From a paper:
The fungal mito-ribosome consists of 78 different proteins, 23S and 16S rRNAs.
To further improve the local resolution, focused masked refinements were performed using the masks for the large subunit (mtLSU) core, central protuberance (CP), L1 stalk, uL10m region, the small subunit (mtSSU) head, body and tail. Protein mS27, which was previously partially built as poly-Ala, has been identified directly from the density as a helical repeat protein consistent with mammalian counterparts. In the mtSSU tail, we found an extra density corresponding to helical structures of protein chains. In our structure of the mitoribosome, IF1 coiled-coil forms a helical bundle with the C-terminal extension of uS17m and also binds to mS27 and h44 rRNA. It is also bridged through a metal ion Mg2+, coordinated by uS17m Q162 and the backbone phosphate of h44 A1745. The topology of IF1 homodimer is such that the C-terminus of each monomer points in the opposite direction: one towards the mtSSU body, and the other towards the solvent.
Numbering used by the authors:
A (entry chain ZZ): 42 to 219
B (entry chain NN): 2 to 113
C (entry chain 77): 223 to 401
D (entry chain JJ): 81 to 268
E (entry chain YY): 55 to 100
F (entry chain EE): 56 to 180, 236 to 287
G (entry chain CC): 17 to 171, 193 to 369, 403 to 508
Amino acid sequence: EGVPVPKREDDAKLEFTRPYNPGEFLSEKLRSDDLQDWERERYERALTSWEQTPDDLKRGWSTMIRDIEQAAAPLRRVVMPRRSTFWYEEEKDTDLITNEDGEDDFHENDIMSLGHGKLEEHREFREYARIAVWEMPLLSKYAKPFVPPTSEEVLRFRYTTYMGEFHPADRKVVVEFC
Amino acid sequence: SMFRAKKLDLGCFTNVRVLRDHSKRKAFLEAEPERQALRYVIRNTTLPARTRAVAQLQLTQMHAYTRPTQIRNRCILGGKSRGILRDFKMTRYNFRMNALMGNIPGVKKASW
Amino acid sequence: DDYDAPPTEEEKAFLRGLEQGKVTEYVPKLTPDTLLGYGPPVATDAALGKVESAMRTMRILGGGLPFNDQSGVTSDPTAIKHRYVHEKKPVFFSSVEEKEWVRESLDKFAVSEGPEKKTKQKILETSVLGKYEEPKYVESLTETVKMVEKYQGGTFSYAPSDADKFNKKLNQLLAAGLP
Amino acid sequence: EQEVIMSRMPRSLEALYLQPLRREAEYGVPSCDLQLRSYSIRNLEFFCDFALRAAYYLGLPAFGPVPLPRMIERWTVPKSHFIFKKSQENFERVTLRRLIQIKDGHPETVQLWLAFLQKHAYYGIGMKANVWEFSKLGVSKAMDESKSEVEKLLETRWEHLSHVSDMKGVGNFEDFLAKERLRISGGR
Amino acid sequence: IRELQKEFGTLGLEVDDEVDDDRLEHLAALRARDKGAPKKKRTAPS
Amino acid sequence: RSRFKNVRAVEMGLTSDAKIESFTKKKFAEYTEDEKAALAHNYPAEHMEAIEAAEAAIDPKDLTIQGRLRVDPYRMPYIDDFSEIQPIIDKRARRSAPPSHKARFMDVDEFTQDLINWADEIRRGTGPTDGDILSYILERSSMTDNNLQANSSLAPALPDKVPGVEGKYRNAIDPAD
Amino acid sequence: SASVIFSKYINNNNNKLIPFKIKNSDLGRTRYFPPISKEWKNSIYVFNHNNLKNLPLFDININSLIKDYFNLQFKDKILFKKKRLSKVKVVSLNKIYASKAEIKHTNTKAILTVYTFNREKISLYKKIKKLKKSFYFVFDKIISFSERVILSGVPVLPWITESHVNIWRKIIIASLYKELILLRKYKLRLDLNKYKFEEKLLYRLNNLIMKYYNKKVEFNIVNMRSFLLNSDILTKILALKLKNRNARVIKIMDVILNKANLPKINRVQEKASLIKSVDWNLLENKFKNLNLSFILNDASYAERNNLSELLNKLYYNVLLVSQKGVWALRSPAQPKVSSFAKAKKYAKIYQIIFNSINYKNMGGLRLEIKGRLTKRYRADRSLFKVKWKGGLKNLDSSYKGLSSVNMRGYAKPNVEYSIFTSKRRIGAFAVKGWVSGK
RNA sequence: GGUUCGUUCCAUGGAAUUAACGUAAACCCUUGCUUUAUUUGUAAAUAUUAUAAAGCAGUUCACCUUUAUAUAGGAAAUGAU
Ligand SMILES: [K+]
Ligand SMILES: [K+]
Ligand SMILES: [Mg+2]
Ligand SMILES: [Mg+2]
Ligand SMILES: [Mg+2]
Ligand SMILES: [Mg+2]
C-alpha cells in the first residue's frame, strides 16, 4: 500500500554454478543430502561404472566438452554496435545487437501495402474459382425438379431470411389466397 | 448515485455525465414495464376515479432516473451532448474526422 | 574479424518452402450435411427449413454465436467451463472436433452428450411446431386484466418477464382504487 | 501406358470462362427474391455472378441481377468543432444493391441455394431473401404430423447442444430466448 | 491489456502497459519535486 | 415462350432443332470412353466425381443457344484447373492439428530431452547435416506439445523477384565505404 | 388442374427477351479497380445497424490489443537472464511493428488483416545462426558416448528403464548447463517470435478479440520486407526514435529517406500522355459477337470447333506443355493431387498476376514532424520539419490521363497517410507520413 | 517578344538543368450514344420510360483567318454534330 516501491525480489537461481563432470556430479548426489535410498543404488552403480572406465576416455570426455564451449563462444560474444547505428542506438539488450550491415537493403521481393490488397483479392478469386469448378457441380446431385402446385395447395406463404443475421422482421409470415 | 454501479462497466469514453446518462439508461430498462402500467391506468378513462388518482401519484414518486425523457445520446468518443448523430453515436466533428480516415464504413465525402 | 556468411542456396530453398508455401492437396466435399447449419431458418413445409430453425434455437441457447464450422476447433476453455458449471447454461459446439478439443484443454471436465429430453421438447414446441397462446377476444371494455393480456399476447415486444412487471403493478393499482 | 490427347477440358472448367448460364422457367412464378447490398460495387457484382452459377447447377432459373435504386444518406457537418459555421461539407453513404429473383424453384432446392451462398458469402455484402411456398389448408395439422419427420433429422444434430442436468441458468425457457435474442441483436 | 497480460501470463510472457506505466511515472515525478496530491481527508472540516 | 431471341440462331442456320443437335454434337461433344479413363487416372476419386456431375448438369444445348464468352472485369486472367493449392497465388493451407491448451515452453530438463530426441531421429533416419540443423531452428517446436506444427496465419510470401519490381532498383550503399 | 392463386402469377410475364445484340462500337479497357478493403477499415454491410455503430470504437480497442500482443516477451526468470534493473524506461526498437487492422466482415466470421515488420527475427536468426555446426556434431557424440559407459557395461535393450535415463540425462545437463541455457535462450526467443504468427498463440488472441465482434476472427498477417512499404510502420519507427531527448530530429529524417530506394525513371516518358486508340487485342473488341454459335461456327479459323481450342488461343493455359499445343494426359498414404500438378509451371502466371497490380513500387515519401522537440526544459516555441523524397502523384491519371478511382470520394488510391502522436518531457508532438506507390 | 482560360505553348537570353506542392489532369453529379440486366419499376410490345454497372464522345470534322514560319485563332438560330 501507499507509495509503491520497486519489487527487487526477482531472480532465478541456476541449478549448477560450475560444470560438474560425471565423477564429481555423482559424488555430490551420493553424499545423501536429500535423496531416496532406493535411488542411491542407481547413482552408486553409475559412479562405480564411470570409475571402471579407462582413464583416456575420461580425458576424452573433458576435451569433448571443451570444444563445445569453443563452438558456443561466438554465440555469447557481445557485438559492439556500429558507430553510426540506427537500430541499436539505445538497445540495452546486447543479445539482439548485430552487425546491422545490409539489414535494410531492398531485394525487390516485396510490394507496397496497397499492392497486397490487390494480391489478396486474387487469392480470393482463385478460392471462388476453385469452388465453382469442383464444389458447385456437386450441387446438381441433390437438386429436385419443380412441380406446380395442385388444386388443393391454395395458400401461398412468404418467409423472410437475413442469412445469418438476427433482424426483428424475420419473424413475420405473410399468406395470400384466392 | 444509488443507480451508479460500484464497478465501472463502460468501455467507451468515460465522463462524469456519461456515467450519469448510462445509469439512467439502465434504470429505465428495469422500470419501463412498471412505468407503462401507470401510464396506462392514468389514460384509461374506464377505470374508477380513485384508481386513476393512485397511479397518478405513484408515477410522480418514481425516481428521475426512471424517466425516459432524461435519456440524451452522447458521443462515445468525446462525451458531448450537442451535435450527436444517432447513426454513429458521435458528434458531427468526430464523424468528420473518422469519416475522412476511413473508420466509418460506407461513408464518403459527397459531391454532386 | 567476424563475418556472417551469405545464406547458402540450400538455406534459401528451405526458407522459400516455409514462407511461400508448398503444393498441398485439396479434396472437394459438398453434401447437404456440410451445408446444414448455414441454411435459412424458415418455417416451411420442407423439413430442411424446420431443422434450420431448430439449429438456430440451439445457437441462441449456447451463446448466440454464428454457425462457423470452417474457422478451426479452438475456443476459450475457461469461459466455457464457467458458463457450463457456474452459470449453468447450455453450450453450443459447431462440430464434434470442437467439443473434444475442450475436453483435452481442461483437466477432468465432463460435458453431456446432448440436451435433456425436456430441452428437446421445448425447442420443438415453439420453434418448429409453432404452438402459441391465442389472444382471446374481449368484448367488454371494463375487463382491464383480460384486455391487457390480449394486447400482451399479440406482440413479441412484451417478453414473459415484461408482462409480469406490468401485471404486478397493474393489479396493485386496481386493488388500491377499490373500497 | 500411353498418352491420350484430350479433345477438350471439363465443362465445369470451361463454364468458368463463359457468362453464367441460366435455366428457363416454364411458368414464371417467383419462388425467391434475394436482395444483395454493399457499400462497394466491385464485390457486389462479383458475388452476383457467383450466385447465378450456383442457381444453374441446382436447376433454378434465376433472373437478374436487377439493379435496384441506390439508397443515399446525406449529412452536412461543420468542418470545425468550434464556432466556425460558414464552412461545412457534405458527406454521404450510398448503398449499392442488386436483386436476383428465382422462379419455378423447388422449395427445398431453393434452401440449398441459400445455404450455399451463406457458407461462401463474400465479405462486405449483406443479403436478404424472401421465400415463397404453396401449402394446403389445415396448417395446424400439417405441422403436427411433421414432428416425427423433423425429429429423425435432428437425431444426429442434438450433439451440438449440451448443458448440465436441469439447466438452472436458463430459468423460464421462453423468456430466456426472448431476452437472449435481444442481447445477440444488440437491442432489437 | 490487463486481460491480455493475465491470458499470456500463464505462459511466462510479459508486456508493459505504456499508458499506465506512463501515468505512474508522472505521479512519481510530482512527488519528487513536491507536487503530488495532499493526504485525502476522511473527516468533515472542523 | 422462350427466354432469349432467335435472331442470333437463324443467322447461323439453326432455325430447326434438328440442326441445333448437329451443331452441339459437333462442337460440344461429350468425353469418349478413352478420355474418361485417362481423365480418371490422373485426378483422384473426389475430383472425378465433380467432373462427372458437371457434364451431366451442363447440357450442350444451352452452350449452343445462350453460351457466350465472358468479358467481365472479374473473370480469371488465365486457365487453370485449380485442383491443388499453390504456394504463392493461393491462401496458405490449414491442415495441421489444433494447438494444445496445456502446452508450455520447455524448461532446461524438457528442453534437453527433446534435443536428445532430435539427435536420435536424425541419426536413426557423419553427424547432423546443415539441412537438419536448419530444420531444428525453424521447425522444431519448443513447447510441450509433442512437436506440433500448427497452422501459420502468415500470408504467403512473394517471389524472390516480383515481376514489375525487379530490374528497376540499384542499391546506393556501396560496401567499399 | 392448377390453382387460381398459381395462375395469377403466371400471367404476369411481360419480360424483355435477351437480344444478344452485336456490338458495333469500339470499347476501351476498364479502369483499374483498386481493392475494396483499402477504402474503409471495416468492409461490412448488415441489415441491422446495431452491429455497425460500435466499429469505430472497437478499432481503437482492437489495435491496442494487437500492438501489445506483438510486444510480448519472456520473463527474465524464465530464460534465466539477469535483469539489469534501472529507473529509466528503455525504448525497444527491435520488436514486431504492426499497422492498423483491416477487417473483412461476413455474417459468419471476420478476417483481420495486419501488416507487420518483424525486426526481432532479423536479429535472433542471425545471432543463433552463428552457433557453428560443430556444436550439434559434438553434442551427438556425447549422447552415443555417454550410452556406452553409463547405460552399458565396461568394454534398445530390455534392461534400460526410464529410471536410469533420468540419471543419465542429469549428468549431461550438469556438464553442459552453461551451454544449454544459452541455446535455450535464443531457441525460445526465436520460437516465441514465430508462434506469434501461428495458431499456437493466436488462438488466445482470438478469444480476446472474439468478444468484440461475437464472431471467430481469422488472422491474415502480412510480413513486410521493408518498413518503408507501410506508412503506419514508418511513422511508428520515426516516432520511437524522436522520443529521446538527445535525438537529432533532422538527422533521423535524413537516415530514413536515405534508406528509401526509388526506381529509375525517364521523366520525359513518365510525364508523357497517352493517345486513345482502339486496342484490338482486348477480348471485347476481338469478338464483337460473343455467342459461341457464331464464334465456333467456322468464322475465321479452319475447324476450331472445340471450345477449348478457342480458349487456349485467348488465355494462358498451364495444363499445356506447349502454350498453343495440346493437352496430353497419360493413360494406362500419398497426397491427393493430379499426376501433372508437379509439371505445371507458374512462371508466366506470376507475371500476369503481378503485372495486373498497380502501386507496387515505392513512388514517393514524405515526413512531417511538428510539436515540442527542443532539447532544453523550458517554454520554447513549437518546431516543424518537413522532408520528402519522390512524389505523391497518381501518375496514371495526372500524366497519362487515365481514369482512376478515388477512395472515399476524395482520396488518391496510391497514397497511404498515417499520423502518430507522442510526447516529450516538455510537450506533445506528432509525426505525419505519406507513402505513394508507382 | 508573342500566345493562352492558365509559368499554357513557341521563340529567345554573355547561365541554366531539374524536384516537390498548388495548378493541370483525373474523380463525383449531369448531357448524347453503345452493351449488359427486367423486379418490387414499365399500357402493349418485335423493348422505347425508369433503374444502374461498364465503355465511348468535342472544339472532333468542315469553313475562314493565320506573326518570326516556330507555337494558332475566329465565326455562334440558318456547316456537320
Ligand atoms: K408477448
Ligand atoms: K437508359
Ligand atoms: Mg501540494
Ligand atoms: Mg528558361
Ligand atoms: Mg484541380
Ligand atoms: Mg413484376
